[PDB]
């Protein structure tokens, strides 16, 4: 949709092509060659990249980027609002207890039955039975409170800080990339604590792909949290099986931008188009739609 | 496992129980190997098929297959009408009874809207209201916080009321001594200084200590043994948390054995075919013998006996009246 | 300076990539509704 | 008896008997410490000097409940007063 | 008196209200223990009018809302 | 200390360093900003 | 023979036996009874 | 019930100490305990 909008606003006809190697764009440190969509622009195989490509320094040094069409940051994905079960009522007071309270129930109605005002005999029976039920209903009330008090205590991850503080729930990031680096380089105490844990965690908390990190969250029975881009996290949250959740504020701020080869005649117009679409409120419409 | 390996490699075999009953270590004085490792290195046996841990000191002198069983360090834990007399203090039960007869005697001096004894019934009602409310509120406290109940190494590390330890020598102690992981370093700092000693001489001692120390000891040992004991009578222990590390049992052959390759491939085949999983399930589980969210019958039971006792007392008072 | 990257400005000067990200945000400073909560209105 | 030790130890150190380097006393003295420890003597010594020669529960109180007892007897007395006047 | 019919009705209704008042008491205690905390989101603000909300009378913040096609901001 | 921010950010924008058109500083300044960001210096500076 | 801690710096100049006693950094605080009928007037406000 | 629950919920650990400033706390002015804290890389101890 965004491609159709900028093509229209810039006045050009285009052909959508999926990147051959399926990559975003990184420079091999040894061969010094660019891969992915960045490689296709640098080497002249494409004249514009319209995709969720982050504006980074290293890429900006070799290609041109429009102003960001969408914001993002590192966020937390956890495996997760319905839980009836009438069996939460039979738990407080044990099935064994409901039974005995019924046996003693008829056990008193039979004792009184043998009796027939101040009939001292059956009188103390009514008193003792009252003291008996008093204790039980008090126990039920007290016990029911602990299950509700603890139910509120459960605040079980809601932030990076929550994550940083423990080790029941493992957590990791993509095995290579900007999110891993963010933690490796960070000088912030919470993030540095999360890094020293992650780099030594065993088994490895790092994943080869983003899809693996999502699948790991979904298949780890509540024992794995994944650090990924907010845009992706919020998108999966809206996908069935609807078992994931985005928690905490973004850890940093980045942006996606449309890229073109350096010195491209398309660069000026394409940037102006992004400012316009943003101002018309179109980019927000597009994000809400998808 | 021996039968499966022999079948896949194509050999006939004789099972021989190691004479000294040992796994295999170098004698401190002579540096001679004992146990099954000894039988291999001194030419008495062709292969060892046993729960023999893959270790550096052994891999220097014999060859191990890839692991046929994985395992790790793990936590073993053990799974009073006086909890009813605690909420409301014995002293309070007394006074509430003294004031009880203290009101039945005041009313006794009285004999509808008899203002005199009227406010007595009202004040006494407000009195018992506060007490039963206090009992209820207080009873809610113990069942809410419930401080001493161990579910993780993290839990163990944060407290000292439940002591925990390992065999006094060997790999489990060494794991903690060497670990740079924060939780295990914290555990090691505690264990090495704890008094009385948290270390034991034998697995049997450790397991007995778990069973008989009134929930005040957890034992750290290999997961396979922990899991096995969890499935035997008296069914009073269990493994908690995941494994804390990873190691393996392997089949061992003497250096230069023509069996080395075939044995290794056999183990990987049996693993990938799911045979080893099934075999573990057979011998541990098929042959087996066995936060807070629950309310017990124990406490409530004590109130049931005092009820029937009251009924019986009445059934006695009834007979005499007639 | 904390100078926002905007279209009208990018037409006349050049901006670096952002050195600080920011966004629109909400600032805020009994209730008998704490009695209707325990027991739900539906109940 | 106004102080209290709280929390687990933050680190681990140890006291040791020292001798000049190369001392002829070093080997024997170390072996003696292992022995005394194993015989359980060092633990006996610590208990003797720390605990034997030392100079120093759960649920609800009666205090709060007591206040409700006095207001009860007070009500009984008030009634015993209202009774007398009625007669 | 002992009209068995309506008799068990009074008993069952009593047991019913007993459970409810016990639930209310227990739940209220949880509330009085944890007591976690009146606006936490733009969604909250959008759904009500007792708490007014606004922006600078000119500039980008006002323009964001004027231009937005996102349901909550519209 | 009587106010607070609630919710996340509702949109995204950025502050940037600005240079006049044709400045020989443009490139170096841009790369400097990306370096400081990736090294974690700007996060630390904001925290300060 | 004293409560002398085995440390690296000292070990480099003298010989130390194995430890006869363990220790670590701990916390010492100045130190469990509180009646006051005013804990009954608090729950329900005056 | 809440007044007794919270009553169970005034220093019992380093972590308790690290979290506040009503109760001051220190160590010998020179020595291994002071150094332990000066050199420590553990979050509680560094705080």
Curated annotation (Swiss-Prot), chain C:
Coiled coil: none annotated. The gene is Gria3. The postsynaptic actions of Glu are mediated by a variety of receptors that are named according to their selective agonists. This receptor binds AMPA (quisqualate) > glutamate > kainate. Homotetramer or heterotetramer of pore-forming glutamate receptor subunits. Tetramers may be formed by the dimerization of dimers. Interacts with PICK1, GRIP1 and GRIP2. Found in a complex with GRIA1, GRIA2, GRIA4, CNIH2, CNIH3, CACNG2, CACNG3, CACNG4, CACNG5, CACNG7 and CACNG8. Interacts with CACNG5. Found in a complex with GRIA1, GRIA2, GRIA4, DLG4, CACNG8 and CNIH2. L-glutamate binds at residues 2, 4, 9. Belongs to the glutamate-gated ion channel (TC 1.A.10.1) family. GRIA3 subfamily. This is Glutamate receptor 3. It is found in: Cell membrane; Postsynaptic cell membrane; Postsynaptic density membrane. Ionotropic glutamate receptor that functions as a ligand-gated cation channel, gated by L-glutamate and glutamatergic agonists such as alpha-amino-3-hydroxy-5-methyl-4-isoxazolepropionic acid (AMPA), quisqualic acid, and kainic acid. L-glutamate acts as an excitatory neurotransmitter at many synapses in the central nervous system and plays an important role in fast excitatory synaptic transmission by inducing long-term potentiation. The chain holds residues 501 to 549 of 888 of the full protein.
Curated annotation (Swiss-Prot), chain D:
The M4 transmembrane segment mediates tetramerization and is required for cell surface expression. Disulfide bonds join 1-56. The lineage of its organism: Eukaryota, Metazoa, Chordata, Craniata, Vertebrata. Induction: Down-regulated in the pyramidal cell layer of CA1 in the hippocampus by global ischemia. It comes from Rattus norvegicus. It is found in: Cell membrane; Postsynaptic cell membrane; Postsynaptic density membrane. Belongs to the glutamate-gated ion channel (TC 1.A.10.1) family. GRIA2 subfamily. The chain crosses the membrane at residues 65-85. This is Glutamate receptor 2. Homotetramer or heterotetramer of pore-forming glutamate receptor subunits. Tetramers may be formed by the dimerization of dimers. May interact with MPP4. Forms a ternary complex with GRIP1 and CSPG4. Interacts with ATAD1 in an ATP-dependent manner. ATAD1-catalyzed ATP hydrolysis disrupts binding to ATAD1 and to GRIP1 and leads to AMPAR complex disassembly. Interacts with GRIP2. Interacts with GRIP1. Interacts with NSF via its C-terminus. Interacts with CACNG2, PICK1 and GRIP2. Interacts with GRIA1 and SYNDIG1. Part of a complex containing GRIA2, NSF and NAPA and/or NAPB. It comes from the Eukaryota. The record marks 35 as: Interaction with the cone snail toxin Con-ikot-ikot. Palmitoylated. Depalmitoylated upon L-glutamate stimulation. Ubiquitinated by RNF167, leading to its degradation. The postsynaptic actions of L-glutamate are mediated by a variety of receptors that are named according to their selective agonists. This receptor binds AMPA (quisqualate) > L-glutamate > kainate. Ionotropic glutamate receptor that functions as a ligand-gated cation channel, gated by L-glutamate and glutamatergic agonists such as alpha-amino-3-hydroxy-5-methyl-4-isoxazolepropionic acid (AMPA), quisqualic acid, and kainic acid. L-glutamate acts as an excitatory neurotransmitter at many synapses in the central nervous system and plays an important role in fast excitatory synaptic transmission. Detected in forebrain. Detected in dendrites of neuronal cells. Expressed in the pyramidal cell layers of CA1 and CA3 and in the granule cell layer of the dentate gyrus.
């Amino acid at each position: 949709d965004l491609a159709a909008e900028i093509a229209k606003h810039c006045g050009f006809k285009y052909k959508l092509t999926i990147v051959g190697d399926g990559k975003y764009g990184a420079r091999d440190a040894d061969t010094k060659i660019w891969n992915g969509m960045v490689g296709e622009l640098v080497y002249g195989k494409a004249d514009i990249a319209i995709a969720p490509l982050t504006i980074t320094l290293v890429r900006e040094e070799v290609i041109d980027f429009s102003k960001p069409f969408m914001s993002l940051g590192i966020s937390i994905m956890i495996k997760k609002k319905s839980k009836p079960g009438v069996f939460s009522f039979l738990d407080p007071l044990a099935y064994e207890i409901w039974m005995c309270i019924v046996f003693a129930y008829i056990g008193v109605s039979v004792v009184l039955f043998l009796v027939s005002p101040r009939s001292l005999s059956g009188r103390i029976v009514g008193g003792v039975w009252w003291f008996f039920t008093l204790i039980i209903i008090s126990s039920y009330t007290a016990n029911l409170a602990a299950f509700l008090t603890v139910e509120r205590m459960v605040s079980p991850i809601e932030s990076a800080e929550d994550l940083s503080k423990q080790t029941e729930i493992a957590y990791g990031t993509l095995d290579s990339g900007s999110t891993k680096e963010f933690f490796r380089r960070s000088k912030i105490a919470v993030f540095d604590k999360m890094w020293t844990y992650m780099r030594s965690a065993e088994p490895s908390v790092f994943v080869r792909t983003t899809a693996e990190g999502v699948a790991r969250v979904r298949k780890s029975k509540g024992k794995y949290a994944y650090l990924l881009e907010s845009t992706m996290n919020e998108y999966i949250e809206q996908r069935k099986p609807c078992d994931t959740m985005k928690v905490g504020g973004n850890l940093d701020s980045k942006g996606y931008g449309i890229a073109t080869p350096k010195g491209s005649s398309l660069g000026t117009p394409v940037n102006l188009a992004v400012l316009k679409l943003s101002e018309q409120g179109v980019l927000d419409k597009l994000k809400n739609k998808w | 496992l021996a039968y499966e390996i022999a079948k896949h490699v194509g050999i006939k075999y004789k099972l021989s129980i190691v004479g000294d009953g040992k796994y295999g270590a170098r004698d401190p004085e002579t540096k001679i190997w004992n146990g099954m490792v000894g039988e291999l290195v001194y030419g008495r046996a062709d292969i060892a098929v046993a729960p023999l841990t893959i270790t550096l000191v052994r891999e220097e002198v014999i060859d191990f297959s890839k692991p046929f069983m994985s395992l790790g360090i793990s936590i073993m834990i053990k799974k009073g009408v006086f909890s009813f007399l605690d909420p409301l203090a014995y002293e309070i039960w007394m006074c509430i009874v003294f004031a009880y007869i203290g009101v039945s005697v005041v009313l006794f001096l009285v004999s509808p809207r008899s203002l005199s004894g009227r406010i007595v019934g009202g004040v006494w009602w407000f009195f018992t209201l506060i007490i039963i409310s206090s009992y209820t509120a207080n009873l809610a406290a113990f069942l809410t916080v419930e401080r001493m109940p161990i579910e993780s190494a993290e839990d163990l590390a944060k407290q000292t009321e439940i002591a925990y330890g390992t065999l006094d020598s060997g790999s489990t102690k060494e794991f903690f001594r060497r670990s740079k992981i924060a939780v295990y370093e914290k555990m090691w700092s505690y264990m090495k200084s704890a008094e009385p000693s948290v270390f034991t001489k034998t697995t049997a001692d450790g397991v007995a200590r778990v069973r008989k120390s009134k929930g005040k000891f957890a034992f750290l040992l290999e997961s396979t043994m922990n899991e096995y004991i969890e499935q035997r009578k008296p069914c009073d222990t269990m493994k908690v948390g995941g494994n804390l590390d990873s190691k393996g049992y392997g089949v061992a052959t003497p250096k230069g054995s023509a069996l080395g390759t075939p044995v290794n491939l056999a183990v990987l085949k049996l693993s990938e075919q799911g045979i080893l999983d099934k075999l573990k399930n057979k011998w541990w589980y098929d042959k087996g013998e066995c936060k807070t969210s629950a309310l017990s019958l124990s406490n409530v039971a004590g109130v049931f006996y005092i009820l029937v006792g009251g009924l019986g007392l009445a059934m006695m008072v009834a007979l005499i009246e007639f | 300076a904390p100078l926002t990257i905007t279209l009208v400005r990018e037409e006349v000067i050049d901006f670096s990539k952002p050195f600080m990200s920011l966004g629109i945000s909400i600032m805020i400073k009994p209730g008998v509704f704490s009695f209707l909560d325990p027991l739900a209105y539906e109940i | 008896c106004d102080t209290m030790k709280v929390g687990g130890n933050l680190d681990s150190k140890g006291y040791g008997i020292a001798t000049p380097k190369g001392s002829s006393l070093g080997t024997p003295v170390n072996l003696a410490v292992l022995k005394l420890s194993e015989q359980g003597v060092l633990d006996k010594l610590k208990n003797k000097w720390w605990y034997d020669k030392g100079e120093c529960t759960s649920a609800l109180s009666l205090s709060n409940v007591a206040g409700v007892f006095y207001i009860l007897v007070g009500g009984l007395g008030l009634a015993m007063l209202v009774a007398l006047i009625e007669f």
